């Protein structure tokens, strides 16, 4: 996985991943979808179609007009949609977890899904589940979706304190300063416009940004534009700073969001491990429980769980991009497993995977990347308690 | 450059671009000659066998060249501090005069203790006179010698880790890991004709051997390369065979049952106690150091549970994903425990390994910055798990 890849974060693609267990436990982000509101495409297009008027495009810049206009037909209709790459990284996943355990999901093996009520959530859940059915017909399949899961997927929706902190909050003047104090435009502008001094200061950097948006979600729609050579590969990576510190702050363990932004997703914790509980004892015949949700769903959910480095609390704005790296966090496509195993002697351990690679929590084991249940269980429990006394507070 | 990484432990120490009143150090002696002549040894004879039955290709007679050129160019010098090693430890002081000059300005009081292996004596020196050059006022109290083994050579004093580390049964694995990993005559295809007629066992001898050479060479300070004698999978594969034996060896490798890891608590109870001095004035030393060795680093570590440096990986073909000896254990690989009094007067640590912030599995609110009360408590609860495992032994 490259630099360039890296440094669109959240908008990265999933990267590359070319006894038996029980159970399965899972929430996924959907796949590489589409820009979601044609915000960014049109603040590019306003400044570029003045200029043009004022006969003061680069060649460059009428370069970048041709692909934009392009971009905006390309992209009608088609706002939010989950990208075929989307579906692609979902059945790749899929596929890859009925070739890992194949017996977990023989013969009439129970499955069960959940999505947001967001259409790519969905169109997530049918991707996984249509390489399932088509796998084995022979599947018992519970399909379902939509606001009754806000409470589960999209937690980050419903509690009024971290609404108001994620709009209006503290970050705010942290991320303004670090944009400014990383990300000059005036070279960017003379890229494609003849004399950029008459840009607003504050417009050019509106202008900027929404040039890296635009460029930096590109590789998730399957389309064979690409715009990384719009900037220098320095020039990405400090634009990835204050995004990777936005999504930081706004989202995860950042000393700013007192861990608030954490706390939230106990309900989805919890979920995971009645989920489990359930599988253990009888009070269900699930082989699997899959759920289709967000980035915001997933990035506090793993810091909540403790694993290692998502936590981490970092006072300096500047370290956080060497301790947090969200694109290793919340790709597109972004999931987390748990797999349950009974051993012989009937002790059940879990493994845990973030984007099928074992993650490690700071609780002990003689056998990584494989912990005891009962440990994690507890472990987690005090998570959940010490995330609904950061909310009492509130 | 992967083809260092792949040096493992012989990897020499990579490239490194308020204020605290107390610094707490542990460092391996810095890039050194290789310890011994069997490697070099092994490959002479064989190729020397070669060439007296013309069975030496064109490439294999320049290699032996290279190696007897290397036999007078190591005469003697077995084991000494290379002037890559004295340069790496001035780095590494310049580098700590230069983050935290107040902590060794004025008279500031620093402590040295090396181990009687003259290599890691060197490493001091070459350390300490980079300080002394700086500030010449500092009060410098400098000793080495066999006084010190409880806590710099415990890897020696342990009866059982010692049969462990003799005859363990971390062996057989290690023995059929390298089996599978190396494939030998890919390799000698390269420097002897039929290759094939060498019976395995002596194949492998071979080009353990011959990678042994390669791999410390760039240590040396002998401007004499040797990877390409390799390509780029076989110095994966031979690193993944090296980092195994050092993980299931000296480190917490299932196998070995935490073992490796435990006697190293003396080590451990006696950086506490120098830093339990300084915090509660008894001792008023700006700094301890102390120049051992990579048997004395990698349980140090491994018992302060640094992150992932003490991973207990049951599947041996796992290990390298998730425990890699050239983070941990370079050449002149160090430890610092640098502390901090904030404007409560609370004490802060922060954990640099091979110069950059550890994690451990306790929680802070400010990392790399952690409660030295939270962290204090932590270790002293490692060091008794390590207690309760020698008890078992
Ligand atoms: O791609 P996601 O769904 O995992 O995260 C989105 C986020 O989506 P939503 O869950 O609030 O509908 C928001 O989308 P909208 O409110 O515009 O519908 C965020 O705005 C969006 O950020 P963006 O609009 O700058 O692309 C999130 O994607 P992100 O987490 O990569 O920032
Ligand atoms: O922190 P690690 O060493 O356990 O994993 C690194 C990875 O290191 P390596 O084992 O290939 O030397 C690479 O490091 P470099 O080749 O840049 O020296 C990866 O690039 C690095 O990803 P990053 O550059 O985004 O931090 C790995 O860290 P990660 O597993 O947290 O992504
Ligand atoms: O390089 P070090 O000193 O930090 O560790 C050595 C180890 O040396 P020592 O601590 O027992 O004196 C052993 O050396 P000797 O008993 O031959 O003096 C090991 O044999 C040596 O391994 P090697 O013979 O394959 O070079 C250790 O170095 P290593 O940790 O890079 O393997």
């Not at 590489?32 to 915000?39: D, E, G, V």
């Not at 992209?75 to 977990?104: C, H, V």
């Not at 489990?276 to 959910?301: C, L, M």
């Amino acid at each position: 996985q490259t630099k360039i890849q890296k440094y669109a974060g959240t908008a990265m693609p999933y990267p590359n991943r070319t006894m038996t267990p029980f159970y399965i436990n899972h929430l996924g982000r959907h796949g590489a979808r589409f820009p979601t509101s044609r915000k960014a495409l049109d603040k590019v297009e306003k400044v570029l179609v003045s200029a043009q008027q004022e006969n003061g495009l680069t060649s460059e810049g009428m370069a970048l007009l041709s692909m934009i206009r392009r971009l905006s037909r390309l992209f009608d209709g088609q706002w939010g949609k989950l990208s075929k790459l989307g579906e692609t990284e979902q059945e790749g996943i899929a596929g890859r977890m009925i070739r890992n355990y194949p017996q977990l999901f023989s013969n009439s093996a129970k499955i069960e899904a959940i999505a947001t009520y967001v259409p790519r959530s969905i169109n997530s859940m049918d991707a996984f589940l249509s390489c399932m059915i088509r796998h084995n017909p022979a599947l018992q399949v519970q399909r379902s979706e939509g606001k009754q899961y806000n409470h589960i997927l999209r937690f980050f929706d419903l509690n009024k304190s971290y609404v108001n902190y994620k709009e209006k909050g503290d970050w705010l003047p942290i991320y303004k300063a670090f944009v400014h104090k990383k990300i000059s435009p005036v070279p960017i502008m003379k890229k494609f416009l003849l004399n950029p001094e008459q840009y607003l200061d504050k417009e050019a950097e509106e202008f900027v940004m929404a040039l890296f948006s635009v460029a930096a979600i590109l590789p998730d729609t399957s389309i064979p534009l690409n715009l990384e050579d719009l900037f220098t590969l320095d020039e990405w990576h400090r634009y990835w700073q204050t995004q990777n510190l936005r999504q930081y702050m706004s989202k995860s363990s950042a000393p700013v969001g007192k861990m608030l932004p954490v706390a939230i997703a106990w309900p989805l914790l919890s979920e995971f491990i009645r989920s489990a509980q359930e599988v253990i004892s009888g009070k269900s015949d699930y082989q699997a429980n899959f759920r289709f949700a967000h980035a915001n769903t997933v990035i506090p959910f793993v810091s909540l769980m403790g694993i290692e480095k998502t936590d981490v609390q970092v006072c300096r704005p500047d370290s956080v991009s060497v301790y947090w790296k969200d694109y290793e966090i919340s790709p597109m496509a972004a999931n987390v497993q748990w797999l349950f195993y009974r051993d012989r002697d009937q002790r059940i351990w879990v493994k845990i995977l973030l984007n099928e690679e074992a993650a490690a929590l700071p609780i002990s084991t003689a056998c990584f990347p494989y912990y005891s249940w009962e440990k994690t269980r507890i472990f987690f429990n005090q998570r959940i308690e010490m995330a609904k006394k950061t909310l009492s507070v509130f």
